[PDB]
């Protein structure tokens, strides 16, 4: 059995063929349509999966946003345009005639990271810090998606009631402070307008402000991890994404978490997959269907 | 078959016989020993359950603090004295010769509250606000205890990084602001020294400081509920405890939650059980054993 694995992001629509061995084969890519209409996405998904769909027996989609009742939702619904409640699972099922599942991309990535761990771990939380902050919760070897697909949206838990307004509408989410976008938005002076990448580079050269923006991110993430430990009693936390995997970042988080009381401590690990974890995690979930 | 349900708290040790009908029968009570030695707790438990133990098939203990490997832990290990790592399950097993389970009291209460709900809810979070703040998470009709018995400790998640220091050692926990002890601790002027009950009365009479202390607690709890919704995707939140059940309190929490973006909204319900939910929950959890 081969899974047609799809990753639906904001900028790119990716698809691959993944068999039982978990290898990524025939990796295809298309840009995400600028026009956010249901017709345009159905066109782009059909075009993306055509040359692959005869070689697969089931479809699995990792999507940015929220999947509820097989349909596309977001924390800021206005960002989807005409794609709000787009029937994502039904669309593929019509286009391919193949059984289809859809999950949030950070939930998909979480499952992949969990399966990459040793067999003794039953409870794990995954956090990705990139442009945004996403998460996924595994409890008793089961991925928690939630009845509405929201579970693990830990980037949108509170970091500071007097912090910046987040894109979701809340004041002071973890994401508004700790993400690459929040790091960049807090930048003043000669750092104003620089992206997270540049800021990490400047911090590497001993730029004090750049360093503090990153310390603030890592401190925010450490407190989140303490929160999640208190809530879920996870046995380890896997940290990924372009910010999360940036050199020295995990060490910073670990150092700040160590300052919390011993009961809130949890083992931290670097993400095993740098790329394509959503694609992989989606295919792995489709194997248990 | 009948469960010898036990509730171990800071002040009082309670025990009852509870059959399949859920009727609390032959309820007894004893004060918790001031000398926190294992010998004194063993004696006080032995005395409490000796008239009941010949009429039960199993023991179930709802306990304050943390239950890890059948032993007593807390978020402040110094607060247990010689009772840190007290082999709670083992003690009962030796005293009664009955199969014994132990669980956190708020986790116990959560399970009872979940069962008293209608059949459609699969995902529920329980929050109790009294002297402290405790919780329990039910996901997919299963109570999440956590591998170390921690899960659902939502009173000790972050409310404000510049908030008051909590008894667990963290700065700015929900509990340190929103709980009855949190409300009493922030009272200034003539209000200083008044308990949460007095503060609640004076608030209803138009005392602006007292009202601010309760508004602050209600607002803090709303933000916690928004966090928990983001993390668990719970379908409803049941709120209990002397503070949580206080007149007007839940409606105020509900008002504050409604100011958050729509995705963070979740139905709030008053606790079905005002007393003895721990005993009931423990016996209910013992039934599925
Ligand atoms: Zn947010
Ligand atoms: Zn605390």
Curated annotation (Swiss-Prot), chains A, B:
One GO-annotated biological process of the protein: N-acetylneuraminate catabolic process
Entry EC no(s): 2.7.1.60
Family: Belongs to the ROK (NagC/XylR) family. NanK subfamily.
Segments passing through the bilayer: none
Pfam families: ROK
Subunit structure: Homodimer.
Recorded metabolic or biological pathway in which this protein acts: Amino-sugar metabolism; N-acetylneuraminate degradation; D-fructose 6-phosphate from N-acetylneuraminate: step 2/5
Natural source organism: Escherichia coli (strain K12)
Entries under HAMAP family matching the protein: ManNAc_kinase (MF_01234)
Recorded name of the encoding gene: nanK
Induction statement: Negatively regulated by the transcriptional repressor NanR. Induced by N-acetylneuraminate, via inactivation of NanR.
Coiled-coil annotated spans: none
Keyword Ubl conjugation: no
Catalytic activity: aldehydo-N-acetyl-D-mannosamine + ATP = aldehydo-N-acetyl-D-mannosamine 6-phosphate + ADP + H(+)
Sequence positions that bind ATP: 5-12, 132-139
UniProt xrefs under InterPro entries: ATPase_NBD, ManNAc_kinase_bac, ROK, ROK_cs
This protein's UniProt keywords: ATP-binding, Carbohydrate metabolism, Kinase, Metal-binding, Nucleotide-binding, Transferase, Zinc
Ligand binding (Zn(2+)): 156, 166, 168, 173
An MF annotation (GO) of this entry: N-acylmannosamine kinase activity
Keyword Acetylation: no
Function: Catalyzes the phosphorylation of N-acetylmannosamine (ManNAc) to ManNAc-6-P. Also has low level glucokinase activity in vitro.
Record-given protein name: N-acetylmannosamine kinase
Database matches in Gene3D superfamilies: 3.30.420.40
